Design a protein around this ligand. Structure first.
Ligand SMILES: NC(=O)c1ccc[n+]([C@@H]2O[C@H](COP(=O)([O-])OP(=O)(O)OC[C@H]3O[C@@H](n4cnc5c(N)ncnc54)[C@H](OP(=O)(O)O)[C@@H]3O)[C@@H](O)[C@H]2O)c1
Ligand SMILES: COc1ccc2c(c1)c(CC(=O)O)c(C)n2C(=O)c1ccc(Cl)cc1
Length: 315
């Protein structure tokens, strides 16, 4: 149920997604993270952006305090937001995340996105046209600051998120590189299966971690409502009926069988418990081929607000 990372640490292959939109009360993250741990999730995925680290941290601490788990059993991820790419801002951002969560270390700290944004108070500083205001930061310098965070023990492991192959290559080719990224957390599901990126990551012993593996929460800010709904896909439905599982379970199992670590967000008690059933069945080669056939280059995150950023990872 774990994969060995390229720095010798271990990552559970199923992770719990903690993002919920602002309209969902902050207190819910506390409740559902406890439910996730109770159901068997041990990998928990958060970020500064999600405005939930206090609640997620409290959930972890509560399950440690009542004896359900030990800290060493939990794999907790947070992420560096894009207004903190300048190297001097990296360690303070991580220290803030640790203070929020009331943890001594994170298991994993990621650069959330390659798209650097103007430093300041706003999460999303935008111009009068609605395009976020970019910053030019050499991400190799950001990476050196992340490495210093690992050396200080603030993060057990470091990685990246939303990097394309070229962007990942730039880090890997850095002169004097101390630590490779352990992972690249990216949008990955049957409509956008990232086969070429997956092959590249495998070739470099970098784990691909899939987000929006169940087709995203379809947030109106970023996602076209016309886009096909992943879990309504007829092929996934047919496979669910064949196996007497659910389309969600088929989508998660697909990723595990490709060697991809998979996240799953649910704030519903029944679905949280359902999602751990991914370890209870297998897909055949013909099933996997059928799912591979769904690939359509559909990144659900698809907005003008970021598509004009100089470091936008999609072509
Ligand atoms: N690095 C990044 O840029 C980035 C970006 C996006 C997401 N993420 C991470 O990845 C996580 C997951 O991605 P996501 O939030 O886009 O959601 P997702 O995992 O694709 O979630 C899918 C949606 O599926 C529903 N669902 C979950 N299990 C289900 C099941 N068994 N049957 C039917 N529906 C089910 C959930 O609704 P209910 O809650 O109602 O169950 C949820 O809103 C996030 O929470 C976050 O931690 C990272
Ligand atoms: C399906 O594609 C995405 C990609 C990123 C997303 C989301 C959906 C949602 C909603 C959801 O998880 O579906 C949130 C909250 N995202 C972010 O955190 C995020 C991270 C980095 C940047 Cl630069 C911009 C946004």
């Amino acid at each position: 149920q774990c994969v060995k990372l390229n720095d010798g640490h271990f990552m559970p292959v199923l992770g719990f997604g903690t993002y919920a939109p602002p309209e969902v009360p902050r207190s819910k993250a506390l409740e559902v993270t406890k439910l996730a741990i109770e159901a068997g999730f041990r990998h928990i995925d958060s970020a500064h952006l999600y405005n939930n680290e206090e609640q997620v941290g409290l959930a972890i601490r509560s399950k440690i305090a009542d004896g359900s788990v030990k800290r060493e059993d939990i794999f907790y991820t947070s992420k560096l937001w894009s207004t903190f790419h300048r190297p001097e801002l990296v360690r303070p951002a991580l220290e803030n995340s640790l203070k929020k969560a009331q943890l001594d270390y994170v298991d994993l700290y990621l650069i959330h996105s390659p798209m650097s944004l103007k430093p300041g108070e706003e999460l999303s500083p935008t111009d009068e046209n609605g395009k976020v205001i970019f910053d030019i930061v050499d991400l190799c310098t950001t990476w050196e600051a992340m490495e210093k965070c690992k050396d200080a023990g603030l993060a057990k492991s470091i990685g990246v998120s939303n990097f394309n192959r070229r962007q990942l290559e730039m880090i890997l080719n850095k002169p004097g590189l101390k630590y490779k990224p352990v992972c690249n957390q990216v949008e990955c599901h049957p409509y956008f299966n990232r086969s070429k990126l997956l092959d590249f990551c495998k070739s470099k012993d970098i784990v691909l971690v899939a987000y929006s593996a169940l087709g995203s929460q379809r947030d109106k800010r970023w996602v076209d409502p016309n886009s096909p709904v992943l879990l309504e896909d007829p092929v996934l439905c047919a496979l669910a009926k064949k196996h007497k599982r659910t389309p969600a379970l088929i989508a998660l199992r697909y990723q595990l069988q490709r060697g991809v670590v998979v996240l799953a967000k649910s704030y519903n008690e029944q679905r949280i418990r359902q999602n751990v059933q991914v370890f209870e069945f297998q897909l055949t080669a013909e099933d996997m081929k059928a799912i591979d056939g769904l690939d359509r280059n559909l990144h659900y995150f698809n907005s003008d607000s970021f598509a004009s950023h100089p470091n936008y990872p999609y072509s």
